[PDB]
Design a protein around this ligand. Structure first.
Ligand SMILES: NC(=O)c1ccc[n+]([C@@H]2O[C@H](COP(=O)([O-])OP(=O)(O)OC[C@H]3O[C@@H](n4cnc5c(N)ncnc54)[C@H](O)[C@@H]3O)[C@@H](O)[C@H]2O)c1
Ligand SMILES: NC(=O)c1ccc[n+]([C@@H]2O[C@H](COP(=O)([O-])OP(=O)(O)OC[C@H]3O[C@@H](n4cnc5c(N)ncnc54)[C@H](O)[C@@H]3O)[C@@H](O)[C@H]2O)c1
Ligand SMILES: Nc1ncnc2c1ncn2[C@@H]1CC(CO)C(=O)[C@H]1O
Lengths: 485, 485, 485, 485
């Protein structure tokens, strides 16, 4: 595995000749991303990210391409990889390397190391490529992360360097961990302070998703967070719109392309009822499914029941479920005994960040036989019961695996928030300690306002007396800090 | 007006002979309020509220009666009044005075000053009764408030005593403000220190609703909050359940009893899309309404659009609305000009805490003529256009004015939070400063767990491995502090 | 029991002084009933109902009152009674007897024999009063019927007159059949051809509901239909709108006023998924209920599954239902064995035409004890289990018994169909045989058009080319005769 | 163009090597089509279609593949073509040619003339191939039709042979009409009575869709219906399930794959509110869209209003619509003038049987310019306004053109009906005249029962007393002939 180089740009992608297709969809997406397009306009003169060297680890989609090109319009240099082995849209990756005025023979874009259907070894090689800038005097100085893999590589890397050794993996370790440690160990043989130096160069990280935010909280509580982080997941305009309405769009899209199964009339088990599980349940309910929900949290469980759903355990419900979706951000939700309990020709997938919600290692070592139907759709048969289960995307987040993830208008919210966070952390870096921050409410309301306007909504303007009555400025922010929407 | 006294209990209510009917509905309600019944059992031996003398200002309904009888079961003495002129359920008021083992001839319950259809003057006389305990050496030492009227009475009262004069009112003050000052001004002529003594005796206030919580944040900003306060509105199990799913139930109930108007096929305008407006929109949508929404907050506005509703102004939409509902907690939403814009036989109501959302003073002074249809339903005719508007509850919150407010199972959440807050504030008073607090998450989780259990929900339990992965205890709390559900 | 007579009108109602309150709601209802009002204008000069002496058996509500004064506006003379012992709105009965221009002292309306809370004896008495015109040479010449009770009295009465004997009642016959036969037997002692002469005078019947229609098909198949009948239920604008959307409104209204039980979060069982069951399920779903459905018809069952509802038997679901509603038009749906299986404080009600959907007779003889809570709400308790059930309206149709039935706007559809059917049979009587007929499609479209317009719907007009391509006239009808909508 | 031949099969498909993939999807579909599988078993020994030579014109999808191998399993020979240029799934075509036991090199399936993306020339050539059986001598004896193109070819073809002349194309009128006449006139040169003889030979036709049924009523009314026809569309289990629920599934799938446009928050315009329009509205609403509906029929319009949708004309709503879908079965819905009024990047599509709902010919002549994005997705730009429109599938039914059409479980209803009608007409042919017939109710109930059971629905069985009460047999049918569900 060696990078391709064309016109001084290193990259590794499926097919550069897809760029023309990619560029057409990027141009359509620009129309549906008023959040990103409005920031390009506002900040074009300013060039706020001049001097930034952004290493981004985030699903390489059409929507992420509009994000990358917003960061470049604003002055940044970037290097990119996908944060999932199946989530890259190859036409979009091609268009990013080529750029808006380039061609396949004369590319003018940025380094991308991403393609749909990477191996675990390829996935971590690409991550390192993305994190490794060409000039050893000029390493990465910002991270843009989705799920924390980039942050993990730099932070665990420095840890092993400081300790003089990369540990062995245990044989019972998850495959991906073994792959990951192998990369660190191999690099340690030839370069002894790689990750330490990169960690000292990173000015901040912006983290897009619930799972990665959890991991940041875990680093920070260990005293191991080496630079400022902005939790972009928990922008109101992100968590409450992307995780919820995005999923409401793209869950059924993933299931449609993977299976073409009728959803109406089917028993559907959704595991977890946070923002993700809420959109799942709503999408399924809208299509005529009979939905039940699982939960550990009594508050989220009570919401599920008030929304018309039984709240049940996997053990009691799994045998009746026509479709099973894991939405928890936890591990060990659907174990091999659960999968063996499923009815014949039931569908199983995961829409949480990591594949470990489903016991895929157990199913693979089970003695069940695998028949591939098409990309990211496998029929698994158990010889002892004779029952076959359809598994989507090998357990990896199925909306991006089997379809195209959330729609542009939704990602416009999430990516306007990331762009704002990148701009804040870069230009105002000396206002942040080595802690996890969220964006102020006035910026979340700014992102909302752009999208209401684009949809044709008419906001009401408070009169002077009304603002005084509420104790707010006419221009916001409108809600107290703990307000939950 | 003078109180009635029977068997040493002072009260003022419509009809003590309604006690038998009241008791029946209280007993039914006990079955639908596991949150309150669970607290009675748990704290029965402890008697945590022994010594408390709670002045309660809160809609005197069946649900409130079960709350009162929880506080007395747990050791408190109470005196009660309603926080709205139209919200009392007379049978429930009678049952509280009589108590579970009393009769109308031998009552064994608590002082209540409340009936449906109070005048403004009577409303404020009753609050004064409720706040004035019989032994001058043993004044109120706890307030339980809904909308802040009791708290306002004590704090403005003490303010004017400290100043040595009660302000005169301006001719352009609302009627209710004039009434309120008249009360304080009258009492100050014969008792110069009444409210100061009460204010010093009060060890804390618990506050049930958004409007009241705002007024608390406004007092604490002014240097003027004399005792700790718990913000019960913003327990997750209150705001996200009472304000939303409560209103989903009781908005259409109030409209039904008042008008029997078909909702399917009608255009409905909901002003505000916070928790209350969300419930409103959801109920109306479920009945086949064509719902549009008004908002000042682009985040809430963007949620409304994502839920299938146009976001519009009162100015553009008012002429087309079959039904108009204010849900803002703000004032001056529907002014005289808007009411005159409304189509013939359109319906107008408020479900926010105070009647000032609608310009009732302007309508009553306008020269429109009023025909009363039935209690809390009035038909107003404008002579110049010839159009008639149906107004519900004279602008007072219509769910409680035209119907019975939220159902028992919902109030059980709110009132379990209220009871917990009373217990915490009473038994641990020294741990609190003169600030607004919210309950810790683990107590909101406790409340939710009781109700999930009661409905037949089955919670999943985290393994030690899962809990470690998530950074949580197996027993909660399960979410970070800023989690919005 | 003896009729009152006042100013030349015989009647028996609760209270004439309710006339003013009734008249206000009648005038409000007129605005919500453009189907009826349009007909009054269209047929004002024509007087198509001159000569007609109409005996109506139909729930004496505000809506029926506007139907009555439409019939009189078009020339008819009427006599009225209700078709249910709990469905009369006493204020509407008073306004009908009084008239738009009468007073309680000098009434100028029509004979009404109806009040809320009739006994079975009083009910059948009133139905005889309604079918018995004062001049014996001018008997009833038309029937307007709901449930088929008036038609049954006339046709059975004649049958027993011809047989020379009214047969004794069987011991295990329902209480009401015993009362119905008493009425006939007692009248037959003194008047040997009363019902023959009325049945010979009746030119036609119009039947407004599914149950009455079934009985008309039954009479006609025995060769006992003495006059032509119009099936008004099966007009598209009746069945698809009244039975379905009317019920979506009034089912939850009845349950609210009777119990104030939270619907969200609760398990609800609907028996039957015809138009009524469909309306029930949708209402319940819209409020956050977890709905299951029972059915004998696999077509209606498949629809319910496609609509997100488990299809289940009474036996499997009864134990866990919080609310149970029967909507089948059939008998013996919830038997005593089921009621004994129900959970503590579960709610039981019927919304089909007759109370025999529920085994009330079994419950009354079971040894369960009854506590009345308020009118049409009874708590029944089994000492053996200690569990209690709330029964609504003694198993009588709960929407009209616990609330006000369907809203004016919906009833406007049904009652325009009935007015048109009355006109058609009266004026074109010799065009009909003694069979059951449905109105022609263009008259259904006519009724629909009126209400689309009233709601602000904008119809598109076919071009000449389009209408030719579809094979229809620009003015309709637009659908083939078997079209199901 | 010339058919391929391998191993005694003539065919014309994209690629035989796609058989393996096709066969996997076919085996998955068999599990989702219990209506078809139940019929294979029921009639396996009987072989009811022995002797039938069926010419089927129907979208060549995985579902139709399972119907084809049902017909052959039952003793028929078949020849197949798709009824739309874009709706063929190429891998299903290959699996049908190859058969369940053949190889790409020695196929053991049946003749198929179909690929995704035919020209109008190719479509009509394929239609002729499908209708022309190899033995002179032994021509088609059964037609299975969808849209009525096959029937039109046979019946109009005969009409010109009786006249002795195929008329001139003309300068204008549709481009497709020209192709159709061209094909006929070319054949008339060499074979003077081809179509007369095929028509004489055809015993009956089964017609799958509303549009083709309308065209049958048009032929029959002319007196030109040459053989018996079964109207399959209007089986209750077809129209109320396929047209409504299948569309609810496949409309958003089409739009998703074509555009990935967010549906939530967008204004959507659905033209027509019959079964397809119903399903369209419901899908969009479930995804959070703001839906409006157009109609010519006041009954259907009144339904849409009661379902929460404004009823509007194209002219009033076109300017603000984000997405526009035609679902009428009529022509000239969205004319060029409308397309010019649409907003920038609005999406336009048709889901009715034919493309003429949308003025494609006017668009193509208007001077707007087309950029192809990917197959069945075109961006058209008007240089005068600078605004662009996305058009799906060149205005052909978008669900099959941009995705996969309705799911197998849905198609299992329609295709069980089709198979049954084919058995009825083939085995009981002498009992039918040259008229349009619908299947009896018991057969509809039969189909629904299979799917209810498949989904785990549990029907209740009437007692003998209940069935007596309703006037029905325990085994059904349960409803009167005119019942609308
Ligand atoms: N009747 C009841 O049973 C009941 C139940 C709960 C709460 N309440 C009361 O309801 C009110 C609202 O409560 P909430 O929890 O929804 O509060 P909230 O703050 O969540 O929602 C109010 C919304 O109104 C909007 N708003 C403010 N001024 C406006 C204006 N001029 N026009 C349009 N929108 C505007 C705000 O942007 C906000 O999102 C408060 O008065 C509260 O005490 C009543
Ligand atoms: N794409 C698919 O998978 C699919 C499935 C089933 C049916 N169809 C096709 O869809 C079309 C519609 O089918 P249907 O079963 O809903 O028919 P339908 O007759 O039940 O409904 C069509 C509706 O269009 C309305 N309409 C007609 N002309 C109109 C106009 N100018 N403006 C506004 N509204 C108008 C009619 O009043 C009618 O109610 C037919 O072509 C049918 O063959 C397609
Ligand atoms: N039945 C009911 N009993 C008592 N309180 C009720 C009821 N229904 C709603 N509420 C209150 C009213 C309010 C604003 O004043 C709230 O916040 C609530 O929770």
């Amino acid at each position: 595995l060696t990078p391709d180089v064309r016109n001084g740009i290193d990259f590794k992608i499926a097919d550069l000749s897809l760029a023309d297709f990619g560029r057409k969809e990027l141009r359509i997406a620009e129309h549906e991303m008023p959040g990103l397009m409005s920031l390009r306009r506002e900040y074009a003169e300013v060039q706020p990210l001049k001097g930034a060297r952004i290493s981004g680890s985030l699903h390489m989609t059409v929507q992420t391409a509009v994000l990358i090109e917003t960061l470049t319009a604003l002055g940044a240099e970037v290097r990119w990889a996908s944060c999932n082995i199946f989530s890259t849209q190859d036409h979009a990756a091609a268009a990013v390397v080529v750029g808006p005025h380039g061609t396949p023979d004369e590319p003018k874009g940025v380094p991308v190391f991403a393609w749909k259907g990477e191996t675990l070894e390829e996935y971590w090689w690409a991550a390192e490529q993305m994190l490794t800038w060409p000039d050893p005097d000029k390493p990465a100085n910002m991270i843009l992360d989705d799920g924390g893999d980039a942050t993990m590589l730099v932070l665990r890397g420095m840890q092993y360097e400081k300790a003089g050794v990369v540990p062995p993996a245990e044989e019972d370790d998850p495959a991906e961990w073994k792959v990951f440690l192998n990369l660190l160990r191999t690099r340690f043989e030839t370069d002894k302070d790689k990750w330490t130096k990169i960690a000292e160069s990173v000015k901040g990280v912006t983290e897009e998703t619930t799972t990665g935010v959890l991991r940041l909280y875990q680093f920070a509580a260990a005293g191991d967070l080496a630079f400022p982080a902005i939790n972009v997941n928990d922008s109101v305009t992100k968590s409450k719109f992307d995780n919820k309405y995005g999923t409401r769009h793209s869950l059924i899209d993933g299931i449609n392309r993977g299976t073409d199964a009728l959803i109406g009339g089917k028993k559907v088990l959704i595991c977890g009822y946070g923002d993700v599980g809420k959109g799942c349940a709503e999408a399924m309910k809208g299509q005529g499914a009979r939905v039940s929900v699982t939960e550990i949290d009594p508050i989220n469980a009570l919401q599920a029941m008030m929304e018309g759903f039984d709240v049940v355990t996997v053990e009691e419900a799994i045998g009746d479920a026509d479709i099973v979706v894991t939405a928890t951000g936890n591990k060990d939700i659907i174990m091999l005994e659960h999968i063996k309990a499923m009815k014949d020709h039931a569908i199983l997938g995961n829409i949480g960040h990591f594949d470990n919600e489903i016991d895929m290692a157990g199913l693979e070592r089970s003695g069940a036989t695998r028949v591939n139907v098409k990309p990211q759709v496998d029929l698994w048969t158990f010889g002892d019961t004779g029952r076959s289960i359809i598994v989507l995307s090998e357990g990896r987040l199925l909306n991006l695996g089997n379809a195209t993830g959330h729609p542009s208008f939704v990602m416009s919210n999430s990516f306007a928030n990331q762009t704002i966070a990148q701009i804040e952390l870069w230009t105002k870096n000396d206002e942040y300690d080595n802690e996890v921050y969220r964006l102020p409410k006035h910026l979340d309301e700014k992102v909302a306002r752009i999208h209401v306007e684009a949809l044709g909504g008419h906001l009401t303007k408070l009169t002077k007396e009304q603002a005084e009555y509420l104790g707010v400025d006419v221009e916001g922010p409108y809600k107290p800090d703990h307000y939950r929407y």
